Amino acid sequence: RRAQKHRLRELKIQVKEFADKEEGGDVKAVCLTLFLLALRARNEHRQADELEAIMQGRGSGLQPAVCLAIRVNTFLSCSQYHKMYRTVKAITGRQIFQPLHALRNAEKVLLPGYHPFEWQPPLKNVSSRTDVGIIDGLSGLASSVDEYPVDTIAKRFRYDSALVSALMDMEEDILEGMRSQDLDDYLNGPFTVVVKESCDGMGDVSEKPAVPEKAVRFSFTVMRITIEHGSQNVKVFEEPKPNSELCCKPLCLMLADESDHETLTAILSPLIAEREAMKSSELTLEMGGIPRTFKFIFRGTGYDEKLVREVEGLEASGSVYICTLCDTTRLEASQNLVFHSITRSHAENLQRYEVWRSNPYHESVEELRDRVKGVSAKPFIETVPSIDALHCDIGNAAEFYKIFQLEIGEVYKHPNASKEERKRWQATLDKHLRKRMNLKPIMRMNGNFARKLMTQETVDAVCELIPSEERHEALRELMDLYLKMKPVWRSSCPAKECPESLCQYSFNSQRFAELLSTKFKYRYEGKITNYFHKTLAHVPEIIERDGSIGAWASEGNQSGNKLFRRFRKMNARQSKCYEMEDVLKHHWLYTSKYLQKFMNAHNA
Amino acid sequence: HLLSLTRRAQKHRLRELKIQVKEFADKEEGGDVKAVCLTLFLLALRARNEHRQADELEAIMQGRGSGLQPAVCLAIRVNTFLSCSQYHKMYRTVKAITGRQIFQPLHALRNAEKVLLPGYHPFEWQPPLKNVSSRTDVGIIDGLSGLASSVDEYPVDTIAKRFRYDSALVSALMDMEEDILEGMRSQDLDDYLNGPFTVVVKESCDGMGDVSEKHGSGPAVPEKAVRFSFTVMRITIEHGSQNVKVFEEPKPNSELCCKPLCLMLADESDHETLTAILSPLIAEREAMKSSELTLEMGGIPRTFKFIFRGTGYDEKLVREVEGLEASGSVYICTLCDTTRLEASQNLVFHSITRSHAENLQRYEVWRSNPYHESVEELRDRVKGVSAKPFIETVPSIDALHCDIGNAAEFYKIFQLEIGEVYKHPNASKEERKRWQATLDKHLRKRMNLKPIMRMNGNFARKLMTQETVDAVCELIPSEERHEALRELMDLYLKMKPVWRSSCPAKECPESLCQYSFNSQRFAELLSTKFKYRYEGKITNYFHKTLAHVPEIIERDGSIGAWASNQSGNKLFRRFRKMNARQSKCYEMEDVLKHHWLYTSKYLQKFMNAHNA
Ligand SMILES: [Ca+2]
Ligand SMILES: [Ca+2]
Ligand SMILES: [Ca+2]
Ligand SMILES: [Zn+2]
Ligand SMILES: [Zn+2]
């Protein structure tokens, strides 16, 4: 101590006077900087980084929101976190992870049912309380033996108290958006939220077999928050990647089929009641001090073709009537390929069901169905007509994979070989393509199978299998017209990212239509599949209507399905009446934005 | 301030002070700039009397601060079933938020893993260990031991991975280093001492039931797997004259201390592939019975000898691996030559007269047929040996089968005496169902217990109480029956705690003696007052309980310490599903590496150091 100072005291007084004579007498700063530069020089920056942290005076422990970010974004249990916490605290003495109770006390801020809020005018048929979280999803549907039997389980939040917490976990993101867009921070204009709604059945959830059980989630997302300052509208907040895995928030879930129509209406009726309530109101709610006012715009878009065909009240997908957007039969599509419009709203379908029920013109079913254009049920969900982006691409992939298997067998020379040539054609196709591209033969086509197979190189491989020569022209021209056509709907913002193909798309599409109708009319002379109608005829109207096609798709809901199985398999109380509380709660906590701001700390 | 400046800027500022301190460092100390910078900066902080930063920086430069030495975070990763990438998520998040590298990165964690697996330490064998390779660093080798998968050969579709026996034995000896040093400190020997230590090692192989991960669709297939494992049970040493116990393993039939040696996805009853994969391990175990290990734990060379005991085989598998008849044999006990008739007759006096050498001799007698007898006189010439024995086993019992056999005799004794069948010897089966139904309703009405068909542990324990026989005894008249059943129940509760002791030399030495007395009294009363229970049927459990208990107690020293339900299958599924690769050839490598690394004593020390 004193003696070891006395060993090197000559340097001590030397460096001391050196620090007084030039650096003034700030001995501590120049000596610590000397130790930093002398310890970094031997490449041991770990000690220097922690020593800079201990001189800066930063705490060793963690805030409970960081601990909750760790416990949710890593899928630990609530019993293994206790293991990690107790032995970290025991080994390094000072605690770094918080205990479980201060974690759950910091959980209740981020769920629905914590904040005060009020509507103006108050909502009809909706309760006025502010502090309800997870309710039973059956909505008091009575289960006595005298009535209709039910056995499903469902949980949900309210709709308004979900939107309140979903707005106040992104308070920082709209405040920084107002700062970066040259607006005054103390503003309380009528903000408009744009909410994209999505619902998709995700069956085969069960774990054991011979009894498959299914499930249905109903979810939403925020997509654009916009204030009207002065005389213009500005995008205060915009979504980075809309159809992402972790930016759609769960709102209701149930264990039922997508086709059990009575149960599905019994659960999704109160949510549509609340949604139709909050379309003529203003939510006043504090956003950093002063209260602000929100007004919502709902677009229900993230439905696949079967769900959008069922709840909007149409005939099923194998109909004579194909388009959910227009009213033309499939025998009318193959003649006029691209000149259609969009004329299937929701209220039009509701009055057409009223026409079907009343039968006011006194005519039989064969012309009444033609008069109402195949509407034969009461539609009960307000949805906008659109096309998807995922299932469209997978459908086009399987369709010209089938045309590859057709063109191997040379049907243009002689038709109608029986169903024994075709299995050989399939075998030679996937054997050849596995030989060249190493693509394993898969029954259920995915999107990655599309991303590999939709390639000019594989076209050249099947060209090396198909005998003739002009078929290479009639196949390669088709494939590069399709590859030119794809990124106008695959893109998330094709108004600015690919504004070349988007302007050349009409010419590029009608040329494709002509090449399908001339050199391929041995398949498309009568029938045509649904997705070649949507991709060809409508998308230069959906672009000018909305913008993207890829942003308004169910890829988030389709990507979230593993989180159901994982959360249920590792984090649940195993009682089937609490078991859907916990899956919903964890899937709420996962896709918060206040927690993903911590797991991107290293990016900052 | 000078604090907030860039390191290039700070370099340009104090370049001359750096020149002066480095020139003093090589004009006085000879260029040890870090130590003199430590002294000057530490004293420049210490002069302001802020000792807290001095203690914290001392703990840093020692390394005892908030550091988490990589074995600790390896223990965290492997004992809470984290993956690899999710650990990387946790590490980069806590490092970016806190600023200091508190969790260690991946590659340092892998380098701290390689020390604990086999294939790190050098060693040698003082006799050079015939038919065993002499290299020191083989890890996981293919468990089939170079079999023939050729199509012209025998068909084989199993997957096996294993370590070598001597390599895994070296690693399991080197993993318990500090525990053996603290062992000889606690008995007050030197902390440096050459050998030889005698290492008593338990041997065990048993099945694992199912492992199928078939999500749903349809029941894909069974897929039964089985492992081969061992346990460093105790370690002794002598100092000239007297042995002394430097290590004793406290929880013997645990799950944390059963180190895996071989894993195969083969059925237990498939005999050929089982003995195919087990034969190299038996070759190495017969190799190391006559050698010496040189091992360099405390900086000095020490010598190790070994003793192997195979007590960890279940009773269905000791009758297969030693060559007895499988299940329906008249020869029931796996220690003596007693037929089922004499085991029904001579209840108490028996002695253990089976081994491995005379079993091999009896198999050769069955093969050679040296007396030209018929098949039946051959069968009672060799006392049940039909197959060729190939694993030296030392079989034993465990307490659950003992008191389950006692309860399954006592339940039928109660049903028989409750209806006075000793005077009415010819009953019909529905009358036995009637007696059973009266006993079931009366026991649920008096003791409030739901009876059941299959007999398990807690039901067999709580049925054998004094209040149970004194509650059922009022349903039978003729109080001679009451006092006789009272005497028999008192005899049973006297005979209970000897195999409920785990060390009966220290628990109950009074009841350890006169076990022959109470056992002969049990036989004399069960054949004297109950001279109607002889239906020619006696289980093997009741025989081993009544006859072969004191020979086992003098043999090993315990009863339920050298034996063995569902504890491994959950661990196998947890390691195969969460943290493993695919491809069926790396999959077994990863599950064997994790099942080795989970069961160390080093990592368990760091894990349950919270309640020290
Ligand atoms: Ca679907
Ligand atoms: Ca789906
Ligand atoms: Ca077993
Ligand atoms: Zn249309
Ligand atoms: Zn016996």
Curated annotation (Swiss-Prot), chain B:
Catalysed reactions, as listed in the record: S-ubiquitinyl-[E2 ubiquitin-conjugating enzyme]-L-cysteine + [acceptor protein]-L-lysine = [E2 ubiquitin-conjugating enzyme]-L-cysteine + N(6)-ubiquitinyl-[acceptor protein]-L-lysine
EC code(s) of this entry: 3.1.-.-, 2.3.2.27
Record note on what altering H51A does: Impairs DNA-binding
One cellular-component annotation, GO: nucleoplasm
Keywords: Chromatin regulator, DNA recombination, DNA-binding, Endonuclease, Hydrolase, Isopeptide bond, Metal-binding, Multifunctional enzyme, Nuclease, Nucleus, Transferase, Ubl conjugation, Ubl conjugation pathway, Zinc, Zinc-finger
Chain positions of site Essential for DNA hairpin formation, participates in base-stacking interactions near the cleavage site: W499
GO BP terms in the entry: adaptive immune response; B cell differentiation; chromatin organization; DNA recombination; negative regulation of T cell apoptotic process; negative regulation of thymocyte apoptotic process; positive regulation of T cell differentiation; pre-B cell allelic exclusion
Binding site for a divalent metal cation: D206, D314, Q566
Post-translational modification: Autoubiquitinated in the presence of CDC34/UBCH3.
UniProt superkingdom: Eukaryota
Cofactor(s) needed by this chain: Mg(2+); Mn(2+)
Phenotype when changing R319 to A/C: Impaired cleavage (both nicking and hairpin formation)
DNA-binding region in chain numbering: 1-62
Molecular function GO terms recorded: endonuclease activity; histone binding; identical protein binding; metal ion binding; protein homodimerization activity; sequence-specific DNA binding; ubiquitin protein ligase activity; ubiquitin-protein transferase activity
Gene knockout outcome: Mice display a severe combined immunodeficiency phenotype. The have a small lymphoid organs that do not contain mature B and T-lymphocytes. The arrest of B- and T-cell differentiation occurs at an early stage and correlates with the inability to perform V(D)J recombination. The frequency of homologous immunoglobulin pairing is much lower. No obvious neuroanatomical or behavioral abnormalities have been observed.
Subcellular location per the Swiss-Prot or TrEMBL entry: Nucleus
Impact upon substituting E315Q: Impaired cleavage
Result for mutant: W562A: Deficient in both nicking and hairpin formation
Subunit-level organization: Homodimer. Component of the RAG complex composed of core components RAG1 and RAG2, and associated component HMGB1 or HMGB2. Interacts with DCAF1, leading to recruitment of the CUL4A-RBX1-DDB1-DCAF1/VPRBP complex to ubiquitinate proteins and limit error-prone repair during V(D)J recombination.
Function: Catalytic component of the RAG complex, a multiprotein complex that mediates the DNA cleavage phase during V(D)J recombination. V(D)J recombination assembles a diverse repertoire of immunoglobulin and T-cell receptor genes in developing B and T-lymphocytes through rearrangement of different V (variable), in some cases D (diversity), and J (joining) gene segments. In the RAG complex, RAG1 mediates the DNA-binding to the conserved recombination signal sequences (RSS) and catalyzes the DNA cleavage activities by introducing a double-strand break between the RSS and the adjacent coding segment.
UniProt name for this protein: V(D)J recombination-activating protein 1
Record lineage: Eukaryota, Metazoa, Chordata, Craniata, Vertebrata
Gene name in the database record: Rag1
Part of the intact protein present: 395 to 1008 of 1040
